[PDB]
Amino acid sequence: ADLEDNMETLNDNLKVIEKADNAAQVKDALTKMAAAAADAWSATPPKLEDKSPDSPEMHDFRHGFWILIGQIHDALHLANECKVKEAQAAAEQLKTTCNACHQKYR
Amino acid sequence: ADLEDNMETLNDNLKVIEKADNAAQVKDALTKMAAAAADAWSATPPKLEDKSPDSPEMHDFRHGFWILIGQIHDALHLANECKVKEAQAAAEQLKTTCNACHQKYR
Amino acid sequence: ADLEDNMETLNDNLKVIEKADNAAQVKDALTKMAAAAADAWSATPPKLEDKSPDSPEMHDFRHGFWILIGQIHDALHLANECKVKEAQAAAEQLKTTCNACHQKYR
Amino acid sequence: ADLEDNMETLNDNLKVIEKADNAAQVKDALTKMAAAAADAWSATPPKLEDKSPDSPEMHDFRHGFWILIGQIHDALHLANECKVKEAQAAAEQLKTTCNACHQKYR
Numbered sequence: 001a002d003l004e005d006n007m008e009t010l011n012d013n014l015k016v017i018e019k020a021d022n023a024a025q026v027k028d029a030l031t032k033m034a035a036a037a038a039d040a041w042s043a044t045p046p047k048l049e050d051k052s053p054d055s056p057e058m059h060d061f062r063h064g065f066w067i068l069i070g071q072i073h074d075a076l077h078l079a080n081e082c083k084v085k086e087a088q089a090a091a092e093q094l095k096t097t098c099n100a101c102h103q104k105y106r
Numbered sequence: 107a108d109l110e111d112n113m114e115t116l117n118d119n120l121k122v123i124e125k126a127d128n129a130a131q132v133k134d135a136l137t138k139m140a141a142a143a144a145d146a147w148s149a150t151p152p153k154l155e156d157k158s159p160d161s162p163e164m165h166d167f168r169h170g171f172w173i174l175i176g177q178i179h180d181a182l183h184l185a186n187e188c189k190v191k192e193a194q195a196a197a198e199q200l201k202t203t204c205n206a207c208h209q210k211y212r
Numbered sequence: 213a214d215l216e217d218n219m220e221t222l223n224d225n226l227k228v229i230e231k232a233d234n235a236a237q238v239k240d241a242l243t244k245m246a247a248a249a250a251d252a253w254s255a256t257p258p259k260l261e262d263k264s265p266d267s268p269e270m271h272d273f274r275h276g277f278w279i280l281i282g283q284i285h286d287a288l289h290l291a292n293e294c295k296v297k298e299a300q301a302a303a304e305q306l307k308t309t310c311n312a313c314h315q316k317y318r
Numbered sequence: 319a320d321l322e323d324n325m326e327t328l329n330d331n332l333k334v335i336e337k338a339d340n341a342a343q344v345k346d347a348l349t350k351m352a353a354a355a356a357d358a359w360s361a362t363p364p365k366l367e368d369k370s371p372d373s374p375e376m377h378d379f380r381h382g383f384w385i386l387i388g389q390i391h392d393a394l395h396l397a398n399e400c401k402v403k404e405a406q407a408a409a410e411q412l413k414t415t416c417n418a419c420h421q422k423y424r
């Protein structure tokens with residue numbers, strides 16, 4: 001999937017989680033988020049088109065995905081344990097990682 | 107790329123790290139490994155081909171890559187700090203993750 | 213040290229980081245936060261003094277420290293890399309973790 | 319507690335995790351190991367007393383506890399999801415981290 005589509009998948013599923021009634025819905029969403037974040041790994045964002053892959057900027061760009069992936073991984077544990085409110089909080093909190101990357105690279 | 111080729115990227119780059127003389131070499135190899143781990147995320151392994159994308163087995167299989175990716179993330183920081191020896195040890199330590207997945211799923 | 217004293221140390225050093233114009237000062241402050249956060253691990257806050265040490269509340273309280281500890285760990289690598297602004301932003305970001313625990317447990 | 323006593327707690331609990339019959343027994347042991355590893359954070363090992371608190375050795379020593387704490391955290395989630403063989407597997411894998419530290423500093 002292209003970068004924009006993975007980003008839409010991340011946005012859609014954060015909202016699903018916010019509004020979720022049960023653990024299954026939160027798990028399903030976090031699962032789709034993980035897959036989207038992992039597929040985005042390799043993408044070159046428009047603002048860095050003129051920079052190579054091994055470029056310093058691209059390393060720092062990709063670093064935000066390691067952070068996101070890790071927060072997704074741990075939130076899915078909280079959902080697996082039926083700790084719905086807790087998993088919803090972890091999801092709300094990882095917005096800071098979304099925002100930081102957008103602020104610098106969108 | 108396919109799962110086999112991602113494994114070859116992981117294997118190859120690990121020996122590069124093993125034998126490397128400087129930080130830049132280790133950084134480049136970890137970067138390639140991180141892309142290959144992320145790309146592997148959604149692969150279905152030959153031995154789980156009778157299991158569904160949402161099944162305990164496929165969740166456990168992907169969990170192994172969350173762990174791998176985490177370890178590669180940290181190892182790159184060590185490489186970035188030019189802590190080459192400490193980076194090669196992390197790369198050695200994460201081989202436990204490679205092998206753990208293999209024993210269960212290869 | 214007690215929990216209040218660890219909280220003062222976390223806060224005081226977060227302010228040092230915000231004010232800092234160099235990596236050395238951010239590193240040192242992140243190091244002291246790490247120590248304060250690990251020392252707070254086993255504290256029982258007043259609002260949970262009526263709860264079992266194995267309660268879901270107490271497990272969730274300690275989980276907030278795990279999150280904080282890992283955010284400090286990553287920010288410190290950023291600081292070791294002389295990514296002064298990126299380390300400051302990470303420190304800014306982990307305030308969400310401080311805020312979340314406080315709102316539930318203080 | 320002092321470094322030696324926390325190391326006893328780490329070692330005793332590992333062996334309890336080995337032999338455990340149920341998830342409750344693994345959860346409880348891992349909880350105890352988390353606390354022991356967090357309490358050990360600050361400790362100056364005998365082999366490094368003559369080093370500065372901000373020497374590379376001490377930074378590296380503390381780093382190993384970050385790695386250990388994150389691994390205990392993840393295993394505890396597996397134990398809480400009743401994935402007892404997977405939590406036992408994760409626990410017995412900790413020894414990669416235990417051994418690496420002992421090799422350099424014990």
Ligand code: HEM
Nearest residue numbers: 003004007010011045061064065068097098101102105106
């Ligand atoms: C975190 C979970 C997260 C969300 C949510 C998110 C959403 C998001 C949207 C809705 C867009 C707009 C899509 C569009 O083009 O209309 C968007 C765009 C970009 N993002 Fe994002 N994003 C989240 C996380 C992250 C992270 C962690 C990074 C960088 C590491 C990142 C980056 C970007 C970039 C670049 C774009 C613009 C891409 C484009 O338009 O082609 N996001 N995101």
Ligand code: HEM
Nearest residue numbers: 110113116117120151167170171174203204207208211212
């Ligand atoms: C860790 C860094 C890592 C390495 C290195 C590695 C290597 C590796 C090789 C060389 C192969 C054989 C490829 C072939 O075509 O014969 C192989 C195969 C598989 N692996 Fe692997 N592998 C590493 C990590 C991991 C992890 C973390 C997992 C699971 C989460 C995993 C899984 C597998 C599977 C399944 C195979 C078989 C694939 C096939 O036959 O098509 N590996 N790996």
Ligand code: HEM
Nearest residue numbers: 216219222223226257273276277280309310313314317318
């Ligand atoms: C994150 C870096 C963080 C900061 C900063 C912080 C600050 C802070 C202050 C300044 C206080 C007031 C202490 C006082 O009485 O003088 C305070 C108090 C509490 N905190 Fe805190 N705090 C941060 C993080 C966290 C986290 C992550 C948790 C829980 C996981 C947490 C908890 C608490 C609690 C409980 C108190 C009240 C203590 C008491 O009144 O006895 N904090 N924090």
Ligand code: HEM
Nearest residue numbers: 322325328329363364379382383386412415416419423424
């Ligand atoms: C990880 C799970 C882990 C285990 C288990 C473990 C065990 C252990 C023992 C049994 C000892 C000696 C016991 C005694 O009573 O003297 C011991 C001692 C030391 N350790 Fe350890 N240890 C584990 C992990 C770690 C980690 C991650 C580190 C460093 C980051 C570490 C370090 C040390 C040191 C230093 C000692 C010697 C203590 C002394 O001589 O005073 N260990 N550990």
Ligand SMILES: *C1=CC(=O)N(CCCCN2C(=O)C=C(*)C2=O)C1=O
Nearest residue numbers: 023080081082083341397398399400
């Ligand atoms: C998902 C979350 C949840 O709480 N449940 C109920 C069954 C889980 C039962 N338990 C334990 O109490 C400990 C492990 C375990 O699996 C879900 O299905």
Ligand SMILES: *C1=CC(=O)N(CCCCN2C(=O)C=C(*)C2=O)C1=O
Nearest residue numbers: 129186187188189235291292293294
């Ligand atoms: C890569 C690793 C390394 O040590 N060096 C040498 C320059 C170090 C520059 N520094 C600091 O000393 C502290 C932060 C920082 O960026 C590399 O180029």
Ligand SMILES: [Zn+2]
Nearest residue numbers: 074077275391
């Ligand atoms: Zn967690």
Ligand SMILES: [Zn+2]
Nearest residue numbers: 180183285289
């Ligand atoms: Zn690290």
Ligand SMILES: [Zn+2]
Nearest residue numbers: 063183286289
């Ligand atoms: Zn990082």
Ligand SMILES: [Zn+2]
Nearest residue numbers: 073169392395
């Ligand atoms: Zn996990």
